[PDB]
Amino acid sequence: SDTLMVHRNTPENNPDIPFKFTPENEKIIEQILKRYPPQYKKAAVMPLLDLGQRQHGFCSISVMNEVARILEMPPMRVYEVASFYTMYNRTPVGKFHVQACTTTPCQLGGCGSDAIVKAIKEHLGINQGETTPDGLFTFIEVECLGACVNAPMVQINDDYYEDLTPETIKQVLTALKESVNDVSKAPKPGPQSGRQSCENSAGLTSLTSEPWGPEKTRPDL
Amino acid sequence: ALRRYPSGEERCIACKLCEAVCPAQAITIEAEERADGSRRTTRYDIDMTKCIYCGFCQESCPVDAIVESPNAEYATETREELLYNKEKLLANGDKWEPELAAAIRADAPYR
Amino acid sequence: RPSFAIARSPNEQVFPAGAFYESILRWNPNPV
Amino acid sequence: VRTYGGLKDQDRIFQNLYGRYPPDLKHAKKMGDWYKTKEILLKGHDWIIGEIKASGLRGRGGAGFPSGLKWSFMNFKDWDKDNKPRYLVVNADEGEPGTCKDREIMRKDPHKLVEGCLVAGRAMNATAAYIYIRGEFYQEAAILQNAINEAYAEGLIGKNACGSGYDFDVYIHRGAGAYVCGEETSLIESLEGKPGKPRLKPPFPAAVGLFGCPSTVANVETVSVAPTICRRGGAWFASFGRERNHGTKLFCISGHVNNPCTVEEEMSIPMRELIEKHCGGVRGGWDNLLAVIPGGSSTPILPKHICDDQLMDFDALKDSQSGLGTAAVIVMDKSTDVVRAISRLSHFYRHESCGQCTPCREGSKWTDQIMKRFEKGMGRPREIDMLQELTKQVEGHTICALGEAFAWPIQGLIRHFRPELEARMKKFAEETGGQALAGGWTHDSRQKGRLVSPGM
Amino acid sequence: QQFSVWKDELTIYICPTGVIPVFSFLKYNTNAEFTQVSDITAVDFPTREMRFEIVYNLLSVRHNARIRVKTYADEVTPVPSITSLYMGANWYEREVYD
Amino acid sequence: YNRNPSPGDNPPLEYTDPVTIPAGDIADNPYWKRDFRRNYPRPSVIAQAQQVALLSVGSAAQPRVELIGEEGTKALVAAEEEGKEKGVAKYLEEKGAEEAKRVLALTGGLPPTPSGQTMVTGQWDVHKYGLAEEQSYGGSYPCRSFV
Amino acid sequence: AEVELTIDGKKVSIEAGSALIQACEKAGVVVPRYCYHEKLAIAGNCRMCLVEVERSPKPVASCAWPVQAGMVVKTNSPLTHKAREGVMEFLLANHPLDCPICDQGGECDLQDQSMRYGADRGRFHEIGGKRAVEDKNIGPLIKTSMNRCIHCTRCVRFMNDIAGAPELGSTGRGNDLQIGTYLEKNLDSELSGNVIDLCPVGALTSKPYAFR
Amino acid sequence: TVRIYKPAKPATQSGEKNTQLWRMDWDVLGKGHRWENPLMGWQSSADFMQGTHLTFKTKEDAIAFAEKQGYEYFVQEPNERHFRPKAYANNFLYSPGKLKHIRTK
């Protein structure tokens, strides 16, 4: 949408807000590093950026500078990775960040994501891109989220809400709104209306028999 | 004559195309960035005793700035009166704009 | 204009570490 | 003389596709995994490569190249005379619209992949594996990381993998959202902490890849079958499909079906039986069908009249001037706006182009604006030919195959739906009282004092 | 010395000592009734020792044919005049000299 | 009637700038198949060094001897080499007068006629001036009419 | 050792491990380029140096193709004519109509290689218009006009490799990829003005020289 | 004195056609090359060779012409490019130790 691909020097996002990873995150960092060859520690920029996007709230310019400092990189080389990839909110987002797939598989399957987007806009009185006045939700459309046989589907923060009707996707959101106070009201992640995962709703047409194990292998092994 | 947009801004942007194409080297142009950062001429001279009146300069203009008026009666007492600076050429456009516009209107589709 | 989920305190974690990052803590390159 | 399809339940690779068992290592033991990995590793890499080559397996990530041939390449002439590491990069990016097969492998049976990397890595003599997960698959990665964690715990992968004396590590790396990072080289640069802009090949990962080291990228399904290809046999797997196309396949069948689902089914199956039996058939019956995308969004469209006897096969879909792709099957009814469906894909590729090269950075946006015009008929018919030419100036003039990925879907639409493109160009002309100009301008643009070049 | 053919123009390259015999042949031969000199000009090539290229243009109204003959000179080498064969060449050669 | 309306009141919208179908089309012309300026002919230059050659062994049109395979190339260079060592006058000297007679055989026996410049009849020829059917001055005046 | 290939029918020798474009400047064969510079790393981005090579399904980037033992290369075939005409159409589709107000005019590789290798006329007339991007402040020396950028990467390679100034880069993706610094910061390098001359187009121009 | 040289390639372009030949120019003298007209500010001149140049195929031709015309003449020789193989694969070479810079493409 209107995501600028340059920096705007705002009072909540400027190179003067200090950033420092929490001690609990510091332990997570050194795990990340051990997976890469020592001299290629820049290979962890995406894990650290994501790890900084979850502690601070969004990928501010200070968090990228912090990561650039840890991994001994020129900060521009980090500004490039952050801006190239779309899971990095370089502007702040709401408490929930509604991502609805609007690609052709999700525009045809089920109701077809047109009513799903309409339901989101109907429930929140917001348009695409803007966030709600109380900051609980940010809404965008996205590209194939990799769950096409379960369309219409949406990704809120880290959970996929598949197989949506414009009625259920309305109650998925209102559950999220009330789930901030009591965690017991959090919606169940996954598909809605019956289907468990990528099954055939009108019964299972495959893998209904007892599975085999190491039974059938030749003597040569 | 040098011409202006409907707002009074000069149309000339100092590309120097007419200075290049002139067959008689009668045009001398000096430009700079103006106080507001605009690409505008500081000098604009036509030696009217070097010109051959071919129209190649108005042919080449990207923005219809330099034009040749329908005026032929401008005979002078001295040759210094025939060395036109930007002050004289803008004044010519400021006076002749209604015909310059009506000539361009009538002749534009063929250009 | 509206509010946001932006870090107010330096030590607090606005978005949870997630199940993946926890499984990087139980990691071990050696047999048990 | 024989039909391909309807394979038995005792003939499938991904038994727990439908979530029969929890993904823990204990249940994977009953599945037949990690069974005789000791023997498989101690058998030389040559024996593993031969078993893969015999299987006829071709890549399942949308290109279908011989995987046994491919993994031999990284065993170059003096592969044992270098101190550099060797890397297996498992492509789990799951980018193609229509495709969701590998998220099911990663959650339901990660150990079919965790063990698959070991046999894949061993055959290529690699020192470690990196698995590149699209970041949007967060639970897919936590589950898979748990499988890796448990595989390290019991000595299945790690220092002494399965007690075989082979040293092999396995790491997850998650992305931050980019379909182009599913490309061969784009995967490698992203892993090096760079923007996922693909690299030019003459340098080939088998020589210089991740970290400049010998490398091989392979799909999750490609790697998730190879151990079974050994424990069951190259002849066992080479028993399906047609002469040059073998084995099983997953099939994410979305769109206007009455029961969308993925299914593992024999390659070279006729598409209709695949649609009409595993997924319940076309919504509103078969006659309501208009067109199918037989791969993901990167394969050309197929009209109803050729779908009737089309084998879902690598070679067979090629003769249809299409591809098997990722074996994603998006079907469309006779109530679809087909140009809108195609134009949405042309919009997807405009957003998923990296921007490194001239033909796809300028051509993915140019084609999108043409397609957005063609939906509403703002154009004249001779522009359809002009759009055909534009796609063919992208087709083989790019660093990566994403240029083909946005040019092919447009071309296939021109190939079977031009009268639909022509019908709504004609309608817009009568609607505005004049044939549209090139670029979408109205016939009277010059009359209303617009700027219209000769020939627009 | 050589001849070249471009589209419909045939050029004949000759050494300066042969100006009289060659133009005598082109004026009087039956297949070469080139009885006008259309033109005589020079082209300066300062990269060449012999700077000047003397280019004559002939017409044959009998055969509706044109032909070009080229020779060379410098600031000190002279060229044989053709004023004895072509009265009209008097002023052209004066222009080359001037 | 004359100059009415003036050209300065002719409507601009009426005149339409003309584009031809191939050159101006948007989908059936690469520029390079109409780039006739860069397909310009090169001058074709023949010197005495390889006029003796063309007399020695013939031409791709009318070869003199077979020049079959190898051992013909060594004769091919000699024809060019003999031209560069001895010119046309020397070549006709040693072959005698019948080589000079074969030179006229290149044009059918007579010397060639120079090419005419009309081609109004389909072939490049002399334009055939004839007396016009109607003579404007009749016969009364010393000016006659030709076509 | 110098291997032997034939380019455009003529034979050329050159050290192995050379670019095929390099074998062309030795063989006196002109090949169009935008991203490739002799003094920089090979980038492969513009697609203007595509030539025909035997046993090769698609045109090859001559700047990035290693000279092989005995290759045969055509720089003047219908394949190369079609590629150079088509790539020129792409680079000129969102390029601004600013040749009169640009300081690169009369000294432009894009107009000189558009006149020599592209069609004479554009087919781009979209009602949606061209791409426009905002200008940038990278110090007192380099005037910016970034609509003109053709994404060659010559200044980012120069600033990062030659000059050791890793502040310039390309943030973004797709048709919205933009050269500049993310933060509005001055370029601090004594070799800075060298990107003005390296710039194929006039997006990165000289502030003191502007319009004079 | 005249200057005989092959013009170097402009820094601003990659085309090399103006480098093909040898050019002969006339050196600027200290006085009379340019001065400003009092009337319009146009640039006057008393050097009648300022707008002239000759072009030659070889350096020898330029010397021969200047010797024969009686010019003083100075020759500069063109600076030649030092060849070096360029490989795209250098962009991605393995580094066993510290990365000396982070390449950005």
Ligand SMILES: Cc1cc2nc3c(=O)[nH]c(=O)nc-3n(C[C@H](O)[C@H](O)[C@H](O)COP(=O)(O)O)c2cc1C
């Ligand atoms: C734009 C683009 C996107 C791709 N996305 C994926 C993907 O998401 N997953 C995948 O397995 N392969 C993907 N591929 C194919 C890979 O480049 C590569 O062929 C494959 O991952 C490994 O080869 P294999 O499937 O033959 O083993 C993509 C290719 C392109 C050009």
Ligand code: SF4
């Ligand atoms: S061509 Fe026209 S716009 Fe350009 S400098 Fe000359 S008068 Fe000004």
Ligand code: SF4
């Ligand atoms: S009309 Fe006059 S000023 Fe214009 S180009 Fe011709 S001579 Fe020069």
Ligand code: SF4
């Ligand atoms: S084809 Fe070019 S622009 Fe498109 S993704 Fe690949 S490298 Fe980027």
Ligand code: SF4
């Ligand atoms: S850079 Fe673009 S605007 Fe500037 S002169 Fe060249 S083509 Fe014209």
Ligand code: SF4
């Ligand atoms: S600013 Fe100039 S040098 Fe840098 S990428 Fe753009 S066109 Fe290339």
Ligand code: FES
């Ligand atoms: S299209 Fe929406 S998830 Fe694949």
Ligand code: FES
């Ligand atoms: S010069 Fe080879 S692609 Fe740019």
